[PDB]
Each structure stands twice: as C-alpha cells, then as structure tokens.
Amino acid sequence: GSMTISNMEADMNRLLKQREELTKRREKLSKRREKIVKENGEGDKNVANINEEMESLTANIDYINDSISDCQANIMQMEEAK
Amino acid sequence: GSMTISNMEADMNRLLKQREELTKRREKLSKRREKIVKENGEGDKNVANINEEMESLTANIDYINDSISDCQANIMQMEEAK
C-alpha cells in the first residue's frame, strides 16, 4: 500500500540517522585515541633519551668504582702492616 | 712519608665526590623516567576503554548497516515490477 512503503521508507530513514550518529561518534573516539596515543609517542621518545643517558652513567659509575677500588687497594698496601 | 699516601687519599675523596655526582644524577633521571611511565600508563588505560567502546559501536554500525540493507530489500521489492 501507500502507507506500507511510506512506513518502510521512514523506517529506513530512522535507521540511516542511527548509522550516521554511530559512525560519527566512532570517528571522534578514534581521534580521542589518536591524541592519547601521539601524546604517548613523545613519552616514549623522552624515555629513550633518558635510558641512553642512564646507560652512560652506569658505564662511568662502574668505572669510577673500579678506580675507587684500585685507589683504596693501593692505599691499603702502603698502610698495611709489613 | 705520607705525602704520596695522603695524596692517594685526597684522590679517593674526589672519586667519592664524582661517585656522588653520578648516582644522584642517575637517580634524578630514574625519577623523571618513572613520572612518564605513569603518564603514558594512564593514557593507555583510556585507550583501552576507547577501544572497548569502538568495539561495541562497530557491531552496532554492523547491525544498522544490515538493518538498512534488509529494509532496502523490502522497499526494492515493494516498488519493483512483478
């Protein structure tokens, strides 16, 4: 009938409105994610730098300690009983 | 006689100073790095939730797109030639 198709066309249209709301929100949520992600992207960058600086300190710290252990050792030999 | 012994002692103290400058510097960085781990961490929790949401919207979009399609069959058949 005339109301048959008219009702279906309106049902399809009332769906089409849901589809576009649903799809629309997802896109927003996708950019909200993009933000939180990219922001973390700089986070990882800063940490990669720090971890490199620490790796060096660990090298020199070990070296200084090796030097302290040789110093203290030599002091001992000179000071120890003989 | 302690001129050389006292010297090595003096040297040792300065190695301790150097050892003090490094460890505290390796600590400050270790702290900074941990702050970032927390920042990125919280964000990656938001993302996890965004995903769970986008996961449910997709199935909703899938449902509507199917609904729209099925309601196109009805109209496409209730408007065609028989």
From Swiss-Prot, chains A, B:
Localization per record: Cytoplasm, Cytoskeleton; Cytoplasm, Cell cortex; Cell projection, Axon; Cell projection, Dendrite
Coiled-coil intervals: 3-82
Disease link: Fibrosis of extraocular muscles, congenital, 1: A congenital ocular motility disorder marked by restrictive ophthalmoplegia affecting extraocular muscles innervated by the oculomotor and/or trochlear nerves. It is clinically characterized by anchoring of the eyes in downward gaze, ptosis, and backward tilt of the head. Patients affected by congenital fibrosis of extraocular muscles type 1 show an absence of the superior division of the oculomotor nerve (cranial nerve III) and corresponding oculomotor subnuclei.
Described purpose of this protein according to its UniProt entry: Processive microtubule plus-end directed motor protein involved in neuronal axon guidance. Is recruited by KANK1 to cortical microtubule stabilizing complexes (CMSCs) at focal adhesions (FAs) rims where it promotes microtubule capture and stability. Controls microtubule polymerization rate at axonal growth cones and suppresses microtubule growth without inducing microtubule disassembly once it reaches the cell cortex.
Record note on quaternary structure: Part of a cortical microtubule stabilization complex (CMSC) composed of KANK1, PPFIA1, PPFIBP1, ERC1/ELKS, PHLDB2/LL5beta, CLASPs, KIF21A and possibly additional interactors; within CMSCs KANK1 and PHLDB2/LL5beta seem to be the core components for recruiting microtubule-binding proteins KIF21A and CLASPs, whereas PPFIA1, PPFIBP1 and ERC1/ELKS serve as scaffolds for protein clustering. Interacts (via residues 1146-1167) with KANK1 (via ankyrin repeats 1-5) and KANK2 (via ankyrin repeats 1-5).
Family stated for the protein in its record: Belongs to the TRAFAC class myosin-kinesin ATPase superfamily. Kinesin family.
Entry domain remark: The coiled coil region interacts with the kinesin motor domain leading to autoinhibition of the motor.
Protein name, as recorded: Kinesin-like protein KIF21A
Native organism taxonomy: Eukaryota, Metazoa, Chordata, Craniata, Vertebrata
Whole-protein residues included: 938 to 1017 of 1674
